[PDB]
């Protein structure tokens, strides 16, 4: 491919491009989740901020993958970005469940790429994912699960009241 | 009218005087809303502060209109100020709905003056309203709508509890 | 649509959603332009930084449109994001010409939305575009044109040499 | 071997000693490259500094390997250091190509040691190489490739002029 490319399979190169597309899709999903909670008829500004911050983190993930692709001598290829799965996201409970599902899918794609790298004997790819993605995803998913449990505990008691309290007393605003 | 007056119609001059009267009326309404929430039998001090601050903003709006009237070479004319529409304002929900209606009426008067200025080819009037009124009104109305949604969410759960929480955890105090 | 919506046409609401999609498309295009110049076989890091910064500005444009859509009581709707028009962008000259074409298309969409707002008598939309988009686009397009002229002057003399010099002595790095 | 040695194969111990010899050889090569560019008849002081800094980094690599060898309870063994492959290194283009070849050979030796560690089930060796060598080598090789492209772009235009410009405007001096 390149003067610099060394030990970098076409299979990993393509899988990295696909991972960029997944991260950018996830970023777009979080942009939609954030602006839904800014609606005047939803108006949970801590929830909007929580998802806007995730939008930024997923775009920064994609950018780190793209930097690595060029450092390896691979070639970035972009594809269309599919729109998010919903236009309206329901309650904070519904939204957090959607978010966990999303992150679990990202985490499965990271694990699938790690396994490809291991099959291709590409230790720099495995190190990169271990250094910058896999621990961050486990930590995020635990935080989301904690939030889900707290929202569940709250909305089981009194849904509107509970959703307000969660936004006010757990989420940053 | 004046050594300085230029491109400033009698129709806009009169409409500006009427707008001053509307802004001062709105200021008076917010003074009544604020002191109602300071009643010992209502006692929502964040709500009182929210409306007292709006009272001040509407009087500052009127004063900016008056400064502009004199900068254009128009003549300020004051009329009686009608008392606010209610003597007691109900719950925080009722009060916020009254406030949104009030602001929407101010915003319609601004839009009507903008349209007059455009019909009279008065771009300094249009710039002035765009610079100092129209965006501020859209922003305020969105904030009020956000508050309304949060109060609704709260009082649908448990009215007294919800009203206390909103005052404590959304409004500044 | 909403408790707050006032003077906000369905035609402008839809056109704003389309403008968000154009700005996000442009952001994606600039992401591809930036990472192309980071290729080891292209390696113009000031050019990469110039387009990455534009990527960020166009995503911030989209986010400002989305905030305004919610402030007006419109509803954000997202569509698929088409991939950029090229996978490889040629020389700095070719890339800057692509970028000017892109910005001129954004500027035409802004002008078309301004004209719709004027036809719908929506002065808050016109103020918003005048305050935050139209001057910034004219300024950017002039800068790009200046760059284009300098690159042309350089590559007409000695293409590789000239492209290096432009990157080193005009672009930030 | 030792009171402390645990899970540390003789095969990895020997391969580490060989890697020390390769890193010290590379350090010596970069010392020769640096002083060649300090010749009065070559006189590219940014190029001299670039290779002297690499000389230092490769000796620090060797020293880190030696510290790890002792931390594992292996025994350092030193062999003769072969002289660099050339006495005169040509142009900056020629020198950077020599340097990339050198670094690719170091990177292949690191990958070969990683594979040995994986075959021997030595995760501390794999972690050590991933923490301190493999990412640094990928980053260095990308930088060198970027430099190579820029030098090529320059010397294709006007060789002496281009080499001066690269030294002056890319390399630190
Ligand atoms: Cl392959
Ligand atoms: Cl396509
Ligand atoms: Cl690993
Ligand atoms: Cl806020
Ligand atoms: Cl007149
Ligand atoms: Cl009277
Ligand atoms: Cl105007
Ligand atoms: Cl107090
Ligand atoms: Cl309509
Ligand atoms: Cl679709
Ligand atoms: Cl305007
Ligand atoms: Cl840099
Ligand atoms: Cl052994
Ligand atoms: Cl010997
Ligand atoms: Cl490892
Ligand atoms: Cl010196």
UniProtKB/Swiss-Prot annotation, chains A, B, C, D:
It holds the Pfam family Ferritin. Oligomer of 24 subunits. There are two types of subunits: L (light) chain and H (heavy) chain. The major chain can be light or heavy, depending on the species and tissue type. The functional molecule forms a roughly spherical shell with a diameter of 12 nm and contains a central cavity into which the insoluble mineral iron core is deposited. Interacts with NCOA4. Keywords: Acetylation, Cytoplasm, Cytoplasmic vesicle, Iron, Iron storage, Lysosome, Metal-binding. Fe cation binds at residues 53, 56-57, 60, 63. Belongs to the ferritin family. GO terms for cellular component: autolysosome; autophagosome; cytoplasm; cytoplasmic vesicle; ferritin complex. Its main location: cytoplasm. This is Ferritin light chain. Stores iron in a soluble, non-toxic, readily available form. Important for iron homeostasis. Iron is taken up in the ferrous form and deposited as ferric hydroxides after oxidation. Also plays a role in delivery of iron to cells. Mediates iron uptake in capsule cells of the developing kidney. Delivery to lysosomes by the cargo receptor NCOA4 for autophagic degradation and release or iron. PANTHER family: FERRITIN, FERRITIN LIGHT CHAIN. It comes from Equus caballus (Horse). In horse spleen the light chain is the major chain. Residues 53-60 are annotated as: Catalytic site for iron oxidation. The modification N-acetylserine is found at residue 1.
């Amino acid at each position: 491919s390149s003067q610099i490319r060394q030990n970098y399979s076409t299979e990993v190169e393509a899988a990295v491009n696909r991972l960029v597309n997944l991260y950018l899709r996830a970023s777009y999903t979080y942009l939609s989740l954030g602006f839904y909670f800014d609606r005047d008829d939803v108006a949970l500004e801590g929830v909007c901020h929580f998802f806007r911050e995730l939008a930024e983190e997923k775009r920064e993930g994609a950018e780190r993958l793209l930097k690595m692709q060029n450092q390896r001598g691979g070639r970035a290829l972009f594809q269309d970005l599919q729109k998010p799965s919903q236009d309206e996201w329901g309650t904070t409970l519904d939204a957090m469940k959607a978010a966990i599902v999303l992150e679990k899918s990202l985490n499965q794609a990271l694990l699938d790429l790690h396994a490809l790298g291991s099959a291709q004997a590409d230790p720099h790819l495995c190190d990169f994912l271990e250094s910058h993605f896999l621990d961050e995803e486990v930590k995020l998913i635990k935080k989301m699960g904690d939030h889900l449990t707290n929202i569940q505990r709250l909305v089981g008691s009194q849904a509107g009241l509970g959703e307000y309290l969660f936004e006010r007393l757990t989420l940053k605003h």
